[PDB]
Design a protein around this nucleic acid. Structure first.
Ligand SMILES: NC[C@@H]1O[C@H](O[C@H]2[C@@H](O)[C@H](O[C@@H]3[C@@H](O)[C@H](N)C[C@H](N)[C@H]3O[C@H]3O[C@H](CO)[C@@H](O)[C@H](O)[C@H]3N)O[C@@H]2CO)[C@H](N)[C@@H](O)[C@@H]1O
Ligand SMILES: [Mg+2]
Ligand SMILES: [Mg+2]
Ligand SMILES: [Mg+2]
Ligand SMILES: [Mg+2]
Ligand SMILES: [Mg+2]
Ligand SMILES: [Mg+2]
Ligand SMILES: [Mg+2]
Ligand SMILES: [Mg+2]
Ligand SMILES: [Mg+2]
Ligand SMILES: [Mg+2]
Ligand SMILES: [Mg+2]
Ligand SMILES: [Mg+2]
Ligand SMILES: [Mg+2]
Ligand SMILES: [Mg+2]
Ligand SMILES: [Mg+2]
Ligand SMILES: [Mg+2]
Ligand SMILES: [Mg+2]
Ligand SMILES: [Mg+2]
Ligand SMILES: [Mg+2]
Ligand SMILES: [Mg+2]
Ligand SMILES: [Mg+2]
Ligand SMILES: [Mg+2]
Ligand SMILES: [Mg+2]
Ligand SMILES: [Mg+2]
Ligand SMILES: [Mg+2]
Ligand SMILES: [Mg+2]
Ligand SMILES: [Mg+2]
Ligand SMILES: [Mg+2]
Ligand SMILES: [Mg+2]
Ligand SMILES: [Mg+2]
Ligand SMILES: [Mg+2]
Ligand SMILES: [Mg+2]
Ligand SMILES: [Mg+2]
Ligand SMILES: [Mg+2]
Ligand SMILES: [Mg+2]
Ligand SMILES: [Mg+2]
Ligand SMILES: [Mg+2]
Ligand SMILES: [Mg+2]
Ligand SMILES: [Mg+2]
Ligand SMILES: [Mg+2]
Ligand SMILES: [Mg+2]
Ligand SMILES: [Mg+2]
Ligand SMILES: [Mg+2]
Ligand SMILES: [Mg+2]
Ligand SMILES: [Mg+2]
Ligand SMILES: [Mg+2]
Ligand SMILES: [Mg+2]
Ligand SMILES: [Mg+2]
Ligand SMILES: [Mg+2]
Ligand SMILES: [Mg+2]
Ligand SMILES: [Mg+2]
Ligand SMILES: [Mg+2]
Ligand SMILES: [Mg+2]
Ligand SMILES: [Mg+2]
Ligand SMILES: [Mg+2]
Ligand SMILES: [Mg+2]
Ligand SMILES: [Mg+2]
Ligand SMILES: [Mg+2]
Lengths: 125, 138
RNA sequence: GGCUAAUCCCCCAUGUGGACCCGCCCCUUGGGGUGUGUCCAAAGGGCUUUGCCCGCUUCCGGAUGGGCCCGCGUCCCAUCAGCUAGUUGGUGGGGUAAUGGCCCACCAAGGCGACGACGGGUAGCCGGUCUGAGAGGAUGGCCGGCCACAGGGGCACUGAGACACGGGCCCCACUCCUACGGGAGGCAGCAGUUAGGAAUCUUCCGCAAUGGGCGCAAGCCUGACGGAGCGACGCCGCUUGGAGGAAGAAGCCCUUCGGGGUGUAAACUCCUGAACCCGGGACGAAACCCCCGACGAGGGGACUGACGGUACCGGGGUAAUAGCGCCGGCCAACUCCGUGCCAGCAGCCGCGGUAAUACGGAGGGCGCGAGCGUUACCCGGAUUCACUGGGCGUAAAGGGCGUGUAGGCGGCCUGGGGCGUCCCAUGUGAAAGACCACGGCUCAACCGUGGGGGAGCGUGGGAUACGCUCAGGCUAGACGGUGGGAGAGGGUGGUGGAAUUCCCGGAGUAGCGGUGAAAUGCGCAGAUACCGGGAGGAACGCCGAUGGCGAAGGCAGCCACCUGGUCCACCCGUGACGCUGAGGCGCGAAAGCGUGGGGAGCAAACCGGAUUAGAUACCCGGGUAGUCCACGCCCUAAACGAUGCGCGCUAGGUCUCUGGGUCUCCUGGGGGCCGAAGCUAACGCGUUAAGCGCGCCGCCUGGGGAGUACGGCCGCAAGGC
RNA sequence: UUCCCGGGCCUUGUACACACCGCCCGUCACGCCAUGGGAGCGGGCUCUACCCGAAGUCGCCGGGAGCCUACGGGCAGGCGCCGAGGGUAGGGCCCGUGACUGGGGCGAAGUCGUAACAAGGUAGCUGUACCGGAAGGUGCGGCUGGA
RNA sequence: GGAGGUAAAAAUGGCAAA
């Protein structure tokens, strides 16, 4: 546009929107599960992904993904929301930190145990 | 209506160099006459003269171009590779002696009107004045 | 109730001086001086004592700190467009150290706002910090400057200064003590408790230092501070050895089984030596104090350390923690096994459905290392808000079109000012940080010293090319005159013929319409086809075109009236009068709405007949609004050249419309085609640019949701913006 | 050589490219979620008018009534204006909720049709109006993004 | 010889993937 049009109107800042409404953008958020289940993903894939409706401290109720293989989550389980969505599950935008307050780590995990919360096993080595 | 008579001159020059014309006609102005005085000393033209067209004074700016290259596309290289107005009437550009640009690492010229007259970048830093940055030619 | 002392309170005096009224003078907003009148002062204490010291009083001056005012700058929402009663201004008062509607009476009716008032959301601001090539974007944590607060809210008192965190009063909420009647309290100080939360410390030591308060001093107080303690929270420094070591053990992994990999890794051999143990042991400390000199200058002596026996120095002396991410591409690092669209991975594209370098494990590899990954946020990449530095024919995007307010911009010459702009000098731009050198901790992080500068703004002086302004002038822009030209430009009024349908008369008969094939339908009640006559509405064949006109929508028989735009010539006048144009205003196809008229043909909806699996459609036969007229509304479009307007420049060739000429041909305007250069992503554009420029306006910022919902305006509604 | 099937070349159209045994549109059934409307309900903030109104400054009295150290004065006390807030009454914006409802987005293999892309078998799109289970058909005018 | 311009037929193809 012209210079005079830019003195009058100006330039609009983009001001990006959040993809994580965790109420003040905290890194984590404690929440209790309400309904834990399995759903079906989008069209290119097909499996039974474990999901969980979590009643967080902020008053809302959001679906959360359980990572790894196997868990110990129930109707009265306390979890910790991490963030990050699942591409194949529409409606799932958060993740559950394993290894905290009620969600035990992936049993018999050996490689990437920083994620999925599993301690260092000690077999004389 | 000629909102800017200076850019019409520089565009008449630019339009006459792409067709390799001998000369072109720009209207008369004592300020454009001083701008063309700088284009002649630095070597972008041959000169001008206060001609008269139907009782109206114009300026026959004689052009100048490079050697006739061989091979494909035999048109010669331009002596004016680039010319454009900076301080347009919509946005007047005013500069000082510290903020003078290095037009093509000194291989170009920066004409700018000062209180000491129509000078250029190398003459502005020598006298120490600066002013309205008119145009860049290279 | 009663004594009682002072640096407590008061009265009288003295008045250098000061305050106030009035007059005069200088200046010139209440600054300074002067004269008359009036008013105002005050404290004592200690010693080597009729001599100093600490204090007191009044006035002037310095230095510091602060009050008020002004210029400029300071987030988003216009789906917030009007706001204003102490509101705006004056007069006189009150109040304050001091102006002011700060407050009060009276008068005048003003003040602010698209340069965004008012309102709504959010936020303490800065020096700086983070990023970035830069411009900018984001931020205000530690430190420093200013502010605002002290459970929420109001208020004053004392005082140089407070509307006062650890002072007072009152109201509310809450906690606590009660003899129940009326009392106590305010950790957003230092620690600490609880709550909330993903998450954030020790109820530590000391006034040794520096700083603050009091005091002549001695000294007292300081959770200010100096330090210690917790936490990989960040950065920096360091350790888990080092040199040897077999053509190369065991174990494990792969194997085309011949071998290769881990792997000079290990064991082993030398060597040094974290930790640890012993002894010593700080800098930070020198003043205040005392003595000589006069308790001055100068000189001399002594006291004092939390950290801390700590860093550190010397001697001795042990082989002494390694972990995390990744290995499809981006992206550095590959093989075996399991699993079989299961379990699962995932930042993007995407892997997995029997042999997966993408899941899980193992081997091996890569990357970093007391760290490594993840999640959230900021900048970057993002030149995807483009000032540097983007765009709109077809990808997102030119307003349907004009006229025009403000605004932005504006031709040639010569003068005056010097506002923009430019230079020089000066002042400011605190420190810290950052940057460059040199130092101090054994380096670095950290810290000290010095140096260097931005911009911005105030003052003085200069320059006058460009922008602005004032004045004079000029004609190339623009407008006007004179004479003519073409056109479906617009409105009104009248009018011509062909044809369709209907009615009437004559004539005449067994079928007519209709499909792409047939029915419905019409017709012996006399149809179709033919002649004559009449009514009525609508549209104007040939001319007619790839044509003309208008800003667009759009405009076609003919006549006349009213009327607009435009073109050429003559070069006569005005003389820069210009271009664009947010808002507004007006026009705006078709369909649609209201009110009345009209209704021949056509024809949404509707009903038949066919087709069809079905037909709410395509085809056929009927047919109502509508189409048409008058006025008022509606305001849309593939309102398209999907190209806003104005001016200047840049090769031509050819067809056509319309003027002018000394009319072979030239030149002005307009409608087409092909194409120099050039542009473009390509198609294509190309003097009627999508080229090269400049001015102004509208618009764009991934798709769906959506031109939707809410709010606002408009409308009779439909619906529009 | 008109017509069925297959093939060759040229050209044209394409939304097809695991390529017409292609693609693709809407209604319906199911599930998840977000949003609008909705008899209304609950909450925050804010505004206008009024009633009462502590502390306290200031203004008047200071007397049929006190205290006083210099008394045509002071203090106590009393009155009035202002006043934190409380109360009542009507509004304004915003947030949350609500039986039910409208359309929407998403979710591998459900039903019904064949609208579009090839003259897509009725050239398509488009503005408006009417109708129809639905994509959609028809009317009037327009467009070339068609012959 | 330049405009005008010649349909009677007919629905569909489960999902994802070199
Ligand atoms: N997606 C946009 C919207 O989709 C609408 O379509 C929606 C429905 O019409 C459509 O339903 C389709 C159906 O058309 C088709 N005939 C069968 C198909 N199985 C259905 O599919 C749907 O349902 C199944 C479960 O039943 C879901 O797993 C699947 O994800 C979903 N697409 O699924 C769509 C939503 O996924 C319309 N096309 C239109 O309004 C609009 O374009
Ligand atoms: Mg005197
Ligand atoms: Mg006296
Ligand atoms: Mg705040
Ligand atoms: Mg950049
Ligand atoms: Mg508190
Ligand atoms: Mg006082
Ligand atoms: Mg205090
Ligand atoms: Mg306190
Ligand atoms: Mg907690
Ligand atoms: Mg101290
Ligand atoms: Mg001290
Ligand atoms: Mg081995
Ligand atoms: Mg010492
Ligand atoms: Mg690689
Ligand atoms: Mg396998
Ligand atoms: Mg991977
Ligand atoms: Mg693997
Ligand atoms: Mg950027
Ligand atoms: Mg980014
Ligand atoms: Mg830009
Ligand atoms: Mg772009
Ligand atoms: Mg487009
Ligand atoms: Mg104007
Ligand atoms: Mg000018
Ligand atoms: Mg000036
Ligand atoms: Mg500084
Ligand atoms: Mg420094
Ligand atoms: Mg003349
Ligand atoms: Mg003039
Ligand atoms: Mg105009
Ligand atoms: Mg209309
Ligand atoms: Mg109409
Ligand atoms: Mg009508
Ligand atoms: Mg009526
Ligand atoms: Mg009919
Ligand atoms: Mg059929
Ligand atoms: Mg019909
Ligand atoms: Mg068109
Ligand atoms: Mg325009
Ligand atoms: Mg247009
Ligand atoms: Mg032409
Ligand atoms: Mg062409
Ligand atoms: Mg609409
Ligand atoms: Mg052949
Ligand atoms: Mg073909
Ligand atoms: Mg609702
Ligand atoms: Mg008296
Ligand atoms: Mg509600
Ligand atoms: Mg709903
Ligand atoms: Mg079809
Ligand atoms: Mg069709
Ligand atoms: Mg169709
Ligand atoms: Mg239509
Ligand atoms: Mg129909
Ligand atoms: Mg079907
Ligand atoms: Mg098919
Ligand atoms: Mg299929
Ligand atoms: Mg699949």
């Amino acid at each position: 546009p012209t210079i005079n049009q830019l003195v009058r109107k100006g330039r609009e800042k983009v001001r990006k929107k959040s993809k994580v409404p965790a109420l003040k953008g905290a890194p984590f958020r404690r929440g209790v599960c309400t309904v834990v289940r399995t759903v079906t993903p989008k069209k290119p894939n097909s499996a039974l992904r474990k999901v969980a409706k979590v009643r967080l401290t902020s008053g809302y109720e959001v679906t959360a993904y359980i990572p790894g293989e196997g868990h110990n989550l129930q109707e009265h389980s306390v979890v910790l929301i991490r963030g990050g969505r699942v591409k194949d599950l529409p409606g799932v935008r958060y993740h559950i930190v394993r290894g905290v307050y009620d969600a035990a780590g992936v049993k018999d995990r050996k490689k990437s145990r920083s994620k999925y919360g599993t301690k260092k096993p000690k077999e004389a080595a | 209506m000629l909102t800017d008579p200076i850019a019409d001159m520089l565009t008449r020059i630019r339009n006459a160099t792409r067709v390799y014309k001998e000369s072109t006609d720009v209207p008369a102005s004592r300020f454009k006459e001083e701008i063309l005085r700088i284009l002649a000393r630095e070597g972008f033209i041959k000169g001008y003269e206060r001609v008269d067209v139907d009782g109206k004074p114009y300026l026959r700016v004689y052009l100048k171009y490079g050697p006739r290259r061989q091979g494909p596309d035999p048109r010669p290289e331009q002596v004016i590779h680039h010319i454009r107005r900076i301080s347009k009437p919509g946005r007047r550009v005013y500069v000082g002696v510290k903020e003078i640009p290095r037009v093509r690492r000194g291989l170009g010229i920066a004409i700018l009107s000062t209180s000491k007259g129509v000078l250029t970048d190398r003459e502005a830093r020598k006298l120490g004045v600066g002013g309205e940055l008119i145009c860049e030619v290279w």
